[PDB]
Amino acid sequence: KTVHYLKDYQTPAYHILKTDLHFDINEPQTVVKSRLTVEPQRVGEPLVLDGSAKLLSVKINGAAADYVLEGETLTIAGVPSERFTVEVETEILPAENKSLMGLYASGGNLFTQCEPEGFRKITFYIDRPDVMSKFTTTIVADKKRYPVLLSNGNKIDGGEFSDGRHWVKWEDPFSKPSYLFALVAGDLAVTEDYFTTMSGRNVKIEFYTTEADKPKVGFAVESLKNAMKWDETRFGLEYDLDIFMVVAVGDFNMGAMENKGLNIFNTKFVLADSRTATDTDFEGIESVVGHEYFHNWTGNRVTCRDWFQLSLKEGLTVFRDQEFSGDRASRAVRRIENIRLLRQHQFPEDAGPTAHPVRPASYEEMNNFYTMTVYEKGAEVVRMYHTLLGEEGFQKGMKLYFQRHDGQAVTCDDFRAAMADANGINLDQFALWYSQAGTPVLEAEGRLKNNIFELTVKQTVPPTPDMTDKQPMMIPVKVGLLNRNGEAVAFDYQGKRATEAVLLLTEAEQTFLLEGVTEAVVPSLLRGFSAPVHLNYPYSDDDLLLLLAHDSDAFTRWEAAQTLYRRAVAANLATLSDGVELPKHEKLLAAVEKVISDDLLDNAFKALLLGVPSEAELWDGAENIDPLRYHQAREALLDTLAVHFLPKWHELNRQAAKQENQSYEYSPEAAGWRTLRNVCRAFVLRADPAHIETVAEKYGEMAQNMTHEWGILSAVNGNESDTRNRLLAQFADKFSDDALVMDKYFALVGSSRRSDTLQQVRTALQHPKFSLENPNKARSLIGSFSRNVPHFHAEDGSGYRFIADKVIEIDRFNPQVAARLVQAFNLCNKLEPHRKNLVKQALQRIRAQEGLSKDVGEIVGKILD
Numbered sequence: 087k088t089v090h091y092l093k094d095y096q097t098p099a100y101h102i103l104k105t106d107l108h109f110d111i112n113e114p115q116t117v118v119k120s121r122l123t124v125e126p127q128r129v130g131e132p133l134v135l136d137g138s139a140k141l142l143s144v145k146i147n148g149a150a151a152d153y154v155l156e157g158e159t160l161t162i163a164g165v166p167s168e169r170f171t172v173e174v175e176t177e178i179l180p181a182e183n184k185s186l187m188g189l190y191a192s193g194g195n196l197f198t199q200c201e202p203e204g205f206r207k208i209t210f211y212i213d214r215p216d217v218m219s220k221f222t223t224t225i226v227a228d229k230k231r232y233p234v235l236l237s238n239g240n241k242i243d244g245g246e247f248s249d250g251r252h253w254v255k256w257e258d259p260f261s262k263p264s265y266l267f268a269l270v271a272g273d274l275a276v277t278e279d280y281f282t283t284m285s286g287r288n289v290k291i292e293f294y295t296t297e298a299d300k301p302k303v304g305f306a307v308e309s310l311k312n313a314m315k316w317d318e319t320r321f322g323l324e325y326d327l328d329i330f331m332v333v334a335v336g337d338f339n340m341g342a343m344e345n346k347g348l349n350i351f352n353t354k355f356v357l358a359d360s361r362t363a364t365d366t367d368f369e370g371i372e373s374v375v376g377h378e379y380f381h382n383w384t385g386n387r388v389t390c391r392d393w394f395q396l397s398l399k400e401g402l403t404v405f406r407d408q409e410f411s412g413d414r415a416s417r418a419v420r421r422i423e424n425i426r427l428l429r430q431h432q433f434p435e436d437a438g439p440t441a442h443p444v445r446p447a448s449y450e451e452m453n454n455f456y457t458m459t460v461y462e463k464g465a466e467v468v469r470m471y472h473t474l475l476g477e478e479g480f481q482k483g484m485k486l487y488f489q490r491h492d493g494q495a496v497t498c499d500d501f502r503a504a505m506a507d508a509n510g511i512n513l514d515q516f517a518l519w520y521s522q523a524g525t526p527v528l529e530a531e532g533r534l535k536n537n538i539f540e541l542t543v544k545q546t547v548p549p550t551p552d553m554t555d556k557q558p559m560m561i562p563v564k565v566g567l568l569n570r571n572g573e574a575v576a577f578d579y580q581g582k583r584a585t586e587a588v589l590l591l592t593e594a595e596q597t598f599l600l601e602g603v604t605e606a607v608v609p610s611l612l613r614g615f616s617a618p619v620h621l622n623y624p625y626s627d628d629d630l631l632l633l634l635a636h637d638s639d640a641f642t643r644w645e646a647a648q649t650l651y652r653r654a655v656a657a658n659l660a661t662l663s664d665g666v667e668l669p670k671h672e673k674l675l676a677a678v679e680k681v682i683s684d685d686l687l688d689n690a691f692k693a694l695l696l697g698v699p700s701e702a703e704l705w706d707g708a709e710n711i712d713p714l715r716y717h718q719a720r721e722a723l724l725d726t727l728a729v730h731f732l733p734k735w736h737e738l739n740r741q742a743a744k745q746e747n748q749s750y751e752y753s754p755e756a757a758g759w760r761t762l763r764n765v766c767r768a769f770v771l772r773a774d775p776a777h778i779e780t781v782a783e784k785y786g787e788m789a790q791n792m793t794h795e796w797g798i799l800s801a802v803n804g805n806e807s808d809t810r811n812r813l814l815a816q817f818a819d820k821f822s823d824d825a826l827v828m829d830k831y832f833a834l835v836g837s838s839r840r841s842d843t844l845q846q847v848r849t850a851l852q853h854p855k856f857s858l859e860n861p862n863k864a865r866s867l868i869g870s871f872s873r874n875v876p877h878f879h880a881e882d883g884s885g886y887r888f889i890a891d892k893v894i895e896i897d898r899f900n901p902q903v904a905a906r907l908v909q910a911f912n913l914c915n916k917l918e919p920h921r922k923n924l925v926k927q928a929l930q931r932i933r934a935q936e937g938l939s940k941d942v943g944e945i946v947g948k949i950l951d
């Protein structure tokens with residue numbers, strides 16, 4: 087079994103200076119001809135090309151080449167000692183391509199996805215990102231079937247053939263790696279706009295969609311123009327072509343793709359209107375449209391030496407899209423949302439069998455490493471440069487990064503060096519954030535003796551499957567102090583008297599002296615989540631209530647609430663296990679009452695403060711887990727909050743409706759009220775499920791946009807009333823022709839806490855709008871079920887068997903979707919013995935499949951072995 091190792095990296099024996107491509111699109115086959123201008127780097131070595139398409143011919147300098155084709159590699163031993171050409175002819179059947187990698191068909195149209203290694207599915211090539219070439223692409227096709235023919239760069243020629251065909255020629259003047267190649271051919275509607283760069287150059291913007299979906303593309307276009315302006319004002323970065331194209335496609339594996347000048351998007355990150363998209367969907371479009379554009383510099387102009395360096399572009403580009411969204415609106419709230427998502431999804435990864443460093447040392451299948459760790463923890467690592475250096479210093483690093491490496495394929499070490507060198511500071515220890523996996527754990531103690539607050543902090547990083555030795559890391563801990571009345575207390579640290587400081591922990595144990603403290607204090611720690619770590623400090627319940635009510639930092643307030651909730655659930659686990667009455671939670675209920683009644687609070691922030699940690703967060707660190715016990719305990723807490731404050735949930739709902747003020751379009755302000763409203767709806771229907779029939783009677787009046795319909799359907803989704811089923815069926819009927827809304831329907835089917843979810847899911851598999859071969863649908867229904875705790879972790883094992891069945895089935899045509907799905911089983915070793923046994927049986931059965939993909943095999947091996 088082939089494993090790739092970072093320590094084995096070697097520069098390529100050959101460079102490709104020019105890549106000329108010719109696509110002849112017919113029915114059913116597409117014939118691809120290439121002309122590569124190849125430049126020897128290590129003269130005399132064999133030319134090795136990667137490829138898996140059907141090979142028709144290979145030429146060196148016009149003559150039939152002496153070559154051998156073995157597996158997915160073509161080798162030519164006799165190659166010239168100086169510049170030469172290679173010509174390859176391949177044949178593709180795009181309509182048979184259900185992997186959605188390479189050239190494939192969707193909705194009668196043709197699209198490409200080449201990152202990471204899909205280009206070799208199109209032609210034989212040196213398909214690695216440190217090989218950068220200048221591409222020119224000619225496309226020929228039937229004009230009526232394929233009137234729109236697109237590739238990277240500038241369209242420099244085109245014309246008609248008298249047999250109903252036409253052609254175009256695209257020239258991309260920027261050298262690029264193959265993973266950034268894109269082609270689109272089809273009958274697509276176009277929406278046109280433009281942006282003028284700060285140097286005075288118009289950029290034509292073109293969004294391509296189906297004719298029916300064109301009316302839904304407006305918000306994405308506006309978001310792009312906002313992102314372009316923002317990269318100019320915040321980073322000083324300008325676009326470098328006079329054309330920027332975005333193409334939406336409904337069959338797509340990930341979210342979107344940053345192909346130079348020709349971005350290709352999952353429809354879910356381009357299309358919205360208030361009737362069919364939620365406020366959260368809009369925010370997602372804004373984020374991802376920004377993300378892909380920001381890749382133009384962080385990814386395209388400077389790219390990755392090798393795929394181990396993926397976080398070099400993804401961590402940084404995620405950081406950029408986070409800052410973009412934050413500058414647009416609601417910075418504090420949106421920051422909390424990112425932290426929440428990291429701890430809910432990335433922390434369990436770092437604690438599990440597939441844990442890896444932000445920059446992995448090895449991989450079998452690279453598609454398995456487009457992970458929360460590489461992306462979200464990657465972004466947290468980039469943000470720590472910002473925390474250490476400040477915005478000004480961070481931009482100095484960026485400026486030097488581009489000065490040095492524009493046009494190059496580089497490494498995480500080069501980004502760090504740019505930050506270090508531009509600011510004259512030593513960041514050698516910072517490298518460990520790239521090479522050491524696992525969530526660091528801080529233990530802190532505070533004492534006020536004399537007029538100095540003495541904060542002692544230890545750090546440790548647990549062994550991960552790849553590495554036992556973990557050395558102390560560079561961890562910035564932002565701190566402040568509160569007095570008995572919860573106001574900011576000033577202190578002296580490193581010369582400056584301020585109310586806030588960044589304590590830089592670099593050793594296994596350090597003591598920090600905050601001096602000039604003239605009051606009794608409790609510290610506020612890890613403000614703004616200043617490093618991606620666990621922090622344990624001895625807080626009393628009243629310390630937490632004080633932080634929640636009076637602290638100035640959004641994260642620390644939110645973290646205080648999260649802690650009170652965590653403790654309450656732990657109390658529930660204890661009583662439920664002992665077989666006694668539930669706890670009173672008197673302190674918690676008092677704290678929540680204050681939050682509900684506090685009108686100074688941003689409504690979106692209030693909503694977050696009223697959110698309870700997920701089961702996964704709750705059993706983090708536990709062994710021999712019974713997931714249903716954690717579910718029962720969490721549900722009990724939610725039911726107590728629902729019934730206890732039922733009157734106030736109604737009142738808050740009423741206030742939210744009044745303040746929304748019939749403003750049903752997306753805006754950050756309106757969205758905040760609706761978010762709070764939807765929290766209230768969930769609680770109301772927990773306490774009084776019979777309220778569903780009142781809801782049903784007035785459904786039309788309440789369904790003023792999708793945020794409301796989703797909010798309501800989400801709230802009733804676990805209701806055992808027949809009305810729940812009727813409302814869902816009416817939803818499916820209303821939006822039957824909207825694929826993105828049908829995704830929501832299937833998500834509700836799969837995620838329901840009702841007792842009959844497994845059989846409803848199996849019925850949904852046969853719904854005429856469901857397609858297993860469509861990633862959005864597969865993820866919505868099956869993905870949602872796999873995350874449905876009481877059902878996936880059903881004691882009889884029905885959930886495990888069902889998901890293993892679907893991993894096996896899906897892997898036969900789309901290993902990427904299957905390899906993400908199988909990670910539902912990651913908790914295996916931490917489960918109580920009965921469920922553990924059943925999960926291992928499921929994984930063994932997956933492993934026993936003939937022809938199991940490398941993708942799924944890698945994951946299963948990490949869990950099982």
Ligand SMILES: N[C@@H](CNCc1ccccc1)P(=O)(O)O
Pocket residue numbers: 199201202339340341342343344377378381400453456
């Ligand atoms: N670089 C992009 C990765 N998404 C595309 C992709 C990658 C692998 C397989 C299929 C699709 P993003 O981070 O979304 O900008």
Ligand SMILES: [Zn+2]
Pocket residue numbers: 377381399400403
């Ligand atoms: Zn990206």
